[PDB]
Design a protein around this ligand. Structure first.
Ligand SMILES: [Mg+2]
Ligand SMILES: [Mg+2]
Ligand SMILES: [Zn+2]
Lengths: 287, 162, 166, 108, 152
């Protein structure tokens, strides 16, 4: 049953969290220096594997917490809630930086993940839904895309405007819930244990474990929703302000199975767009 | 010089007395017994022991002594200082004004090697802790629970970061 | 005079049991004998009540009243002492639980009027008080909805008894 | 005209705690991307403006020293050159103000 | 009723208003960057633009010379007006002045503004800059623009 699957996946996720945090007992102090343009030289003596870039921002000021979406630790992108693992150099990335590219990608992936959650929890129980992948389409494409295979019973059913509005309502419900984007770098073995009941997720985990040197995979949870992440995500769903499941398109190679791509578009609270601009963006995302 | 001033002192017997003084002084710190601290430690020690612990509760307890305490070095209107090396085992649990643990564990014992320098004044003087010599090779102390922020240069507008 | 606000920082609570919620830190700070009217100070105090430390500082930095600078200095001092002495982990994790202004000791002067008459000037001084509580600011009290308000009305209806009888 | 009766503290509170008289919360405050100090969206950052003002004051002291007295405004353009800088071919024919410090990063 | 009235009532009267604006504008010509109360700077911006136009007219123009003589109290600036500022803006047709609000005056909390002739040698002001084209919203709008151009 879907409820049992979600419960057991969350249980495995929590056991992995407990094991990872127990692997580093006591409080080892790691020095993280602020390499950012503003507030230069501030060095934070943080607890290893417990403290987060959000903790760094909390030490600095509330403005850092509210505006920082990503963290560059030693030059690599990090989630604002991903525990730090060693002394390093930290630089917070906002939406309005000179080159927000990484923040844009993280927001895009987070929006795709929320879309996947809405898709999985929307359909009625009698219909099976299997999320295949979140293609890493550019922002210029005008819509974040999440791919799913629905029950063969609905092979000829296309969502109505009311159905899409219901999906948008569910996504806005998540946004109101304001759930954090919990993250874990966990071995492919545990990832497979979690996703043993999904061939698509299994093979994607295999690809990620092949790409990385070790078998370490990025596993993210918004709430009761485990998913394999292509990259770092944004802090919380409340970052999203405008969110709209624009359309659904069946992919041409239908003979193996119907890969239906859910296309949506969103904008954070920091970059709100007027009503008319949002309408035009919805029109362009519906493609 | 110590013996020609007192006439009943014993270097061999000192270590047990020094250990008793140390334990009693730390229990006085635990119970906030400043009157007894003024008798068990010097005036160069009492501030160092009490200043940073004011307004917070310390739960200190001596559990055992690994190796027997023994005198190490002694040098001498005239004061006599005796350095005693003690490698014992103790416990710490320091809480905030609000009773929130901020250092150590209430039960886990830790091994501590220290060099306590006691001092005496030579009519009614007595032997009291004067200082604690910390070896330069001393192992780093137990880490703190709370994370810390160290501000960088608070540059004025005319100034630029380097 | 009374100086209880300063003493409020010296209360030591007993150590908390392991199975007890972590007690939020409370830091009491004040500035005495500010050359400012307590009535004018009260507006700034009320403005910053219930807000996070960073939000209060931001609001005060861009306020034209003289008392705004003094309150900002007091808040910065409170933050510094909270971090240094009251074991507050994060600077920004503080909110103004209490902010009030009190009458100070005032001096009497004479204002000369037109016909050999006069008035009694009062060189007004005011105190300023702040309590900073660790943790996110408490959420604002939501406006009561129609559902809750009708529920209250129905509860009032049900509470009715047959008065003045058996 | 004089008050007929003393106004009660209740009425006085109703008047002086009215939402009109209360200080309004400003929602136009933001963080300056350059230095990180707070600013209002429509107003220049105080910290950055102070930087520019102090540098301008230094340059103007140099200008005054070069001019040497009132009513000596040059009839030619001016160029500020810092330590380690040589006048460019474009800067040729312009009075050079020499500052005894390195070129500020913000100043270009 | 002040419908259509475009001139602020400043100083001790009309003459005092003209003299105050004249002092502010002389300071602006001399230093190329002046901070002063917002309303006065707003009033004097038009006069600064008009001085630039009169300087563009040229030295030999007697009317322009008279205007410069009146407005520039320090006469060493008239050569500056006709030989530095006007040649600098010869290419431009207008908008010679940049006016930006400054944090309120510390003394009386007065609305303050900084007005500068563009292209001055002084260090650049912290001018407000629009969000980068690489932001999320700007990238989405660039996608819109590309789609429309491809359509046409
Ligand atoms: Mg009176
Ligand atoms: Mg007037
Ligand atoms: Zn700035």
């Amino acid at each position: 049953s879907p409820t049992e699957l979600t419960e057991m996946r969350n249980d495995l996720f929590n056991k992995e969290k407990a094991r990872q945090l127990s692997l580093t007992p006591r409080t080892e102090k790691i020095e993280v220096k602020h390499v950012g343009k503003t507030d230069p030289g501030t060095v934070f003596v943080m607890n290893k594997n417990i403290s987060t870039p959000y903790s760094c921002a909390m030490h600095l000021s509330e403005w850092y917490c509210r505006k920082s979406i990503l963290a560059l630790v030693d030059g690599q992108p990090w989630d604002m809630y991903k525990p730090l693992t060693k002394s390093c150099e930290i630089k917070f990335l906002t939406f309005k930086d000179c080159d927000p590219g990484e923040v844009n990608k993280a927001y895009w992936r987070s929006c795709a993940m929320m879309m996947g959650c809405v898709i999985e929890r929307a359909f009625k129980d009698e219909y099976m839904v299997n999320l295949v992948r979140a293609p890493e389409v550019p922002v210029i494409s005008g819509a974040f895309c999440y791919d799913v295979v629905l029950d063969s019973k609905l092979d000829e059913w296309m969502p109505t405007k009311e159905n899409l509005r219901s999906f948008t309502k569910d996504a806005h419900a998540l946004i109101y819930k304001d759930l954090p984007f919990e993250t874990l770098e966990v071995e492919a073995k545990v990832a497979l244990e979690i996703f043993q009941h999904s061939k698509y997720k299994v093979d994607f985990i295999e690809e990620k474990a092949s790409q990385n040197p070790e078998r370490i995979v990025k596993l993210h949870r918004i709430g009761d929703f485990i998913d394999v992440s292509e990259g770092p995500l944004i802090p919380r769903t409340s970052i999203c302000f405008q969110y709209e499941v624009s359309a659904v398109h069946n992919l041409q190679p239908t003979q193996p199975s119907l890969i239906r791509r859910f296309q949506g578009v969103s904008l954070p609270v920091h970059l709100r767009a007027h009503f008319t601009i949002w309408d035009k963006l919805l029109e362009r995302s519906r493609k | 010089r110590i013996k020609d001033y007192d006439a009943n002192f014993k270097i061999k017997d000192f270590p047990e007395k020094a250990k008793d003084i140390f334990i009693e002084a730390h229990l006085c710190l635990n119970n906030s017994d400043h009157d007894r601290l003024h008798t068990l430690v010097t005036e160069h020690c009492f501030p160092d022991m009490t200043w940073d612990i004011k307004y917070k509760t310390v739960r200190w307890s001596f559990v055992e002594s690994l190796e027997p305490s023994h005198v190490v070095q002694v040098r001498c209107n005239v004061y006599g200082q005796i350095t005693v090396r003690m490698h014992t085992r103790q416990t710490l649990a320091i809480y905030d004004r609000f009773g929130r643990l901020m250092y150590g564990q209430e039960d886990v014992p830790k091994d501590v090697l220290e060099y306590v320098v006691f001092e005496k004044q030579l009519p009614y003087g007595s032997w009291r802790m004067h200082t604690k010599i910390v070896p330069p090779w001393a192992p780093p102390k137990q880490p703190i629970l709370k994370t810390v922020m160290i501000p960088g240069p608070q540059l004025k507008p005319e100034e630029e970061y380097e | 005079i009374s100086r209880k606000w300063e003493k409020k920082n010296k209360i030591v609570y007993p150590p908390q049991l392991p199975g007890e919620p972590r007690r939020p830190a409370e830091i009491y700070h004040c500035r005495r004998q500010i050359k400012y009217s307590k009535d004018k100070m009260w507006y700034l105090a009320k403005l910053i009540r219930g807000m996070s430390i960073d939000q209060a500082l931001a609001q005060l930095e861009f306020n034209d009243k003289k008392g705004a600078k003094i309150i900002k200095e007091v808040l910065l001092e409170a933050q510094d002492m909270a971090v240094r002495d009251h074991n507050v982990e994060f600077r920004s994790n503080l909110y103004i639980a209490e902010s009030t202004s009190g009458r100070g000791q005032c001096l009497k002067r004479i204002r000369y009027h037109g016909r050999g008459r006069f008035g009694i000037m009062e060189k007004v001084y005011c105190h300023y008080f702040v309590k900073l509580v660790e943790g996110p600011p408490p959420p604002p009290e939501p406006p009561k909805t129609a559902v809750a308000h009708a529920k209250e009305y129905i509860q009032q209806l049900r509470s009715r008894t047959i008065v003045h009888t058996l | 005209a004089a008050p007929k009766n003393r106004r009660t503290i209740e009425v006085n509170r109703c008047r002086r705690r009215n939402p009109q008289k209360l200080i309004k919360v400003k929602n136009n405050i933001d963080v300056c991307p350059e230095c990180g100090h707070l600013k209002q969206k429509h107003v220049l950052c105080a910290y950055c403006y102070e930087k520019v003002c102090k540098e301008t004051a230094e340059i103007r002291r140099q200008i005054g020293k070069q001019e040497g007295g009132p009513f000596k405004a040059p009839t030619i353009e001016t160029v500020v050159l810092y330590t380690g800088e040589t006048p460019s071919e474009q800067d040729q024919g312009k009075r050079i103000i020499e500052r005894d410090r390195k070129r500020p990063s913000w100043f270009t | 009723i002040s419908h259509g009235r475009v001139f602020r009532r400043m100083g001790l009267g009309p003459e005092s208003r003209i003299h105050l604006l004249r002092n502010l504008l002389t300071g602006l010509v001399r230093h190329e960057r002046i901070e002063a109360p917002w309303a006065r700077v707003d009033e004097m911006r038009g006069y600064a633009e008009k001085l630039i136009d009169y300087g563009k007219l040229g030295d030999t123009n007697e009317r322009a010379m008279r205007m410069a003589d009146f407005w520039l109290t320090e006469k060493d600036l008239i050569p500056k007006l006709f030989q530095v500022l006007a040649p600098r803006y010869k290419d431009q047709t207008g908008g010679y002045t940049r006016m930006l609000q400054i944090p309120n005056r510390s003394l009386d909390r007065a609305k303050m503004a900084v007005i500068e002739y563009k292209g001055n040698c002084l260090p650049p002001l912290p001018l407000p800059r629009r969000d980068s084209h690489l932001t999320l919203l700007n990238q989405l709008l660039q996608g819109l623009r590309q789609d429309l151009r491809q359509s046409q």
